[PDB]
Design a binder for these strands. Sequence first.
RNA 1: UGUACAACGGGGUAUUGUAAGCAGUAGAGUAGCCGUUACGAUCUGCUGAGAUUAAGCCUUUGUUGUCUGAUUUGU
RNA 2: GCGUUGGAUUGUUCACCCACUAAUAGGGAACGUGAGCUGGUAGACCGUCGUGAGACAGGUUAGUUUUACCCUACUGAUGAAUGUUACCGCAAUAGUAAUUGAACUUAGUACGAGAGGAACAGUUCAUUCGGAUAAUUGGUUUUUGCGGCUGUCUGAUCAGGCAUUGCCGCGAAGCUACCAUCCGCUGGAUUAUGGCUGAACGCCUCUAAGUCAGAAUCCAUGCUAGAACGCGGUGAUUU
RNA 3: GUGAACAGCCUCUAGUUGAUAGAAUAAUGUAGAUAAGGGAAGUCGGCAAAAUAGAUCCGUAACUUCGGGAUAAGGAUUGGC
Lengths: 386, 134, 77, 130, 93, 148
Amino acid sequence: SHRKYEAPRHGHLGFLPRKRAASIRARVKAFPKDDRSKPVALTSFLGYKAGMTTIVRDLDRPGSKFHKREVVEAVTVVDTPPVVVVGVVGYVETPRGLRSLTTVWAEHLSDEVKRRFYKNWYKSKKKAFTKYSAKYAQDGAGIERELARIKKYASVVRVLVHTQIRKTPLAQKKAHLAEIQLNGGSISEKVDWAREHFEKTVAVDSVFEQNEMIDAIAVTKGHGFEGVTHRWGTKKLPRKTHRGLRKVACIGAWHPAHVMWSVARAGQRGYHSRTSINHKIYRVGKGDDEANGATSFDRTKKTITPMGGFVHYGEIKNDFIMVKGCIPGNRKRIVTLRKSLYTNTSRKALEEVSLKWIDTASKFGKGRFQTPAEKHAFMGTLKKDL
Amino acid sequence: NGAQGTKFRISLGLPVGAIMNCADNSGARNLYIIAVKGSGSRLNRLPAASLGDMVMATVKKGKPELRKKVMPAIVVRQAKSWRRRDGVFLYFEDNAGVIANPKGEMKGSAITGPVGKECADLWPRVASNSGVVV
Amino acid sequence: AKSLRASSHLNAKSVKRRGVFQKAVDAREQRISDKLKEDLLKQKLEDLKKWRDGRHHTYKKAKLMKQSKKKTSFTRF
Amino acid sequence: GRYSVKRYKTKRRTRDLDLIYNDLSTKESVQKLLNQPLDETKPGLGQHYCIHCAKYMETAIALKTHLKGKVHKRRVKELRGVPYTQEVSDAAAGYNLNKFLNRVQEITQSVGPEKESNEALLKEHLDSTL
Amino acid sequence: RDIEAENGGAGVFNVNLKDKYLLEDDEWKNDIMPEILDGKNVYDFLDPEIAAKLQALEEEEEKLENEGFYNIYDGFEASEVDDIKEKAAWIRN
Amino acid sequence: MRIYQCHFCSSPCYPGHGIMFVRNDAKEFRFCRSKCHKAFKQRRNPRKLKWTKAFRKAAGKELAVDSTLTFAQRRNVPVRYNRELVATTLKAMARIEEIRQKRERAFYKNRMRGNKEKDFLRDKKLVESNPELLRIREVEIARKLAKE
RNA sequence: UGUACAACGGGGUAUUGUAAGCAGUAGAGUAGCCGUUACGAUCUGCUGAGAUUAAGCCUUUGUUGUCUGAUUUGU
RNA sequence: GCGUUGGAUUGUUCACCCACUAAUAGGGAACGUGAGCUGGUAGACCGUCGUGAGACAGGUUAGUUUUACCCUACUGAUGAAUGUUACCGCAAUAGUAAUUGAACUUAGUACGAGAGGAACAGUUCAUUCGGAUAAUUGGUUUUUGCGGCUGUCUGAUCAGGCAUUGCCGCGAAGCUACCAUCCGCUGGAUUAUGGCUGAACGCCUCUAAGUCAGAAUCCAUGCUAGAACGCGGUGAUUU
RNA sequence: GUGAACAGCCUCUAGUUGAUAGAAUAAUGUAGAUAAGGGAAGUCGGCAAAAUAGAUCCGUAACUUCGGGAUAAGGAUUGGC
Ligand SMILES: [Zn+2]
Ligand SMILES: [Zn+2]
């Protein structure tokens, strides 16, 4: 019958099946549409999530009620050391989909990507790309033939890059590998760009800058086998109901003969692959230049990394991207930053964000001091000193 | 309408069935009844609001001339933990209540004790009748 | 209200895009290309501080003959 | 846990010794609260109000037994010195030192013995009527 | 109103709250005042007459540096004292 | 942006940190953390708790009055914004902090002098107390040096 | 068989709230001795001291030790 | 396509009452005998009747069914064999999600004797829903981390044990809350309807052949999984 | 020993250390516990839980078979030396 009281659904049927993702590194499923008028440009970048922090900003937002007023905001920090290019792939069009017809790799590669190809590195002879390096002999007939194949056919060009995990404090030793699309024009020029860029790095300043809205694609923080109440958001039955109270009691009065795909059962919560769009970059900071965490308003020399470092992460000795709010994934993960897939008709993607202050206090507790010098000055001289 | 400005969001402290204080000398001591204007509609959920929110109420304690009579007016103190978009969390000693007409104009002419910053910015006549903001 | 996929709102957005937003989107591309080229030149400056005929032929003919003996080919019978 | 949670709620919040200091400071404030016209809602119908422990008793004998007690003496021995304002809290950190020191010498000179004499008059008044 | 109409409408035009301000030098229009330093706040230390009080502070500090402000037991020489110390530390352990 | 002081701990309260309480006298009490907030709720006396700065300054720990501590006066009458005046103040603050820290270290030295005399007298009493362990020490040292 | 890995330790960060021991005359009074000694909750000082600090915190020029066991796989 | 509430009333409700709201639309899959969970036989009393045992025109009160460990379905999780192993990818099929209200300005303008009083374009924020997140705030404490308390025991001090985690306070980390924060789009074809050309029918006609616009609709872009018998490109191939 | 107490908690004598074990710490359960602001909006129904609780002092209404009601109610206190 007709339920006597309408109410919305519990959960979203588009984010199904709620299963474990098939890879720790979420897979980019769409890059922006190419305009062959414009220069050669990467469509994406890789990074490692490193905690969160708090900032204050001076908001020039006309129409709003914080116009010409200060605003506290959360931000996420991604360690974004430079990315190394190692290959090219060409993707020809077919009436089945897109097909790869050739992949070309570089001459020399790092132990990191070799470790990625390997699964027991400490026993192997490490014979991965020996014959390919040999194929990189006098004139590289094969290399040039496959590159010319990509220039002739293949329609669209992606570039195989890897990270420099060696730079992070992470204890993994193994780099991630990813195809990132080139969105400029002239397939010939794309291939020439890649050919010139083998064995060379691309920093994050050369892919993004401030006031840019980017998308984060990642995997979300597995919690494991979870029940209905916390996995979909259902009510709880009052108390001491039969066969428990953290579940759906039943379907009603009416009689089906099956259980539907729509009735909110138990299972995995988390480790799902998610794509969260339109996060505004607030700072593209650089390790070469200290006083990253400092500001025009502050003038207090300090890096963004808080006292005692981040929690379950080390220090930021590298270039980093600061975005506002909450991205998917937890600390120590691999996130891909993509750029927006569409021109955004919101003034939010035009306002030149200006910061006043960044919080470099300890996240291993209730932090009250931004610097150990401040802690020293406030506490005063202790017993151990003198 | 009647208020000057947008629907801004500050945490909810005052569900239906909550007796809160009146300290002006219009005659009332207390405010109870049902209704909250600009409240959603969800199964099993209570109408509860603040942000200088307008609410329907009766005098549980006060003069009989205005007991037995439903009336609109506005929250000025809450005692829940509210967040200012400029820094810190704020909270008051208590809840506070007090009386008005649907245009935002007050039956009383002066307010005792502090009144919320955003409540006064949203309701002009509260700011004129209040001597103490925050 | 007017939905997300309302024709009028989308037309208004379409008119806004060609103007003040695409200029800001196109300036960033030139900026970032100018940075990308210098990140190459600095790496060069640091460097100056010091058939397919091999196996595809055999592998593909063997695949095709396995396909034609097992009759498991999409195009050939 | 439950004891602190269910005693020190902001609903059941009491009256912040700073203000009791400012009230016992002057003559008119103490006489007003000794007079305290008949209120139907207050416990003792107004009268029988201790100011140190800001509390309405029912009766004169309940006031007597309150004054002959350590709960009263706790408060009188807490209220002798300065009241610990934000002035103290920031002068400790190196902020508005001179304001704090002016307040301190002001209490030491003017306001201190004022309040002490007021307390003594209160005590002998209560002991004489009771 | 009309400058708004020229640049952009009501909700887009970013007015400069400055350009109206009255200063000694006009070239410094687009400056910013620092609000916070290491732990301190600039507005608290900012007086017109601070350099003279700092000169007095330095005079006082230099007087103290000349004064005695920044600067063995009989019966035991030094090695006797060290022997007693180590014997006592051994005894406690 | 401002840096307030905790009503209890006298510590800095940065933006996005702590809780504020607004008394009926229209008076603000902001705390660095829930520890100090809950102590305020329980009506503790911060001049009796040893982990505050008020207890310290009242007891005669790290000093309370000095010429260094008068510069951070609150200022309710402003000034014309001379950037030269701003730049002078920026250097002045750094200099003042060095001077204050040195004077603080001196105060701590003045407090903790007279401790080594006491420690030495402790050790003297102990060693003159307990000779029967010194025999075990002598014989074991001799045994070890004869062993090596 | 390496800027390798681990167990300990060091440093930083954070939580708590000022350790054990010794002394004082600071201590409501009480007794004894011609003001003085004994008892004495507690207070004051050495002492933001002492303790804990990854078990899913950060860091390491230290000490000590460890690094070829088993099975299986061919176009 | 998306939503269609919160409550009062059991001397009763086959319903009504006042509020909030954009709105508070109707129904089915049970009631075409009988099927989740919850309100609405044995004892006893009053009333009507009966010679009586007892029955009832009634009314009141109290009053023990207890799966799933099987198959299927559903939800999540592995996995043999398709030369071995590893890496990067394609996308058939299936699912799909965003919603509503207010505010500035347009403008006290259009319109109007007056009283009153809109909208497009440009902007800002919130309601319902969803998905993430843990910088901050709050909650949580076997960190049994620190300290304290009662009673008892270890001769006293120290350091500890027991009190079904003994009790009190603070309590990081982790988990977590519209109790905290962040984010949530744009192309083609169409309905009603309005039209162009134009016969049928020497007038005329949006229609018969053709054709332009047009709805929160449809299909796609985008998001989720990835055929375990769907696929490609690529690295190594055994003293 | 605490304490009004053969209550509850710890201990001496005497006795026992028996009840299938090991590793992890998902959901759902069984037995408990805490929770901001609001406080019965929940629900047939305040079911359950919470709150109160010992001892000293003050004080204690209607009604009453004059015997009671009555620990009515409602209030001030509790350590150590
Ligand atoms: Zn009192
Ligand atoms: Zn504090």
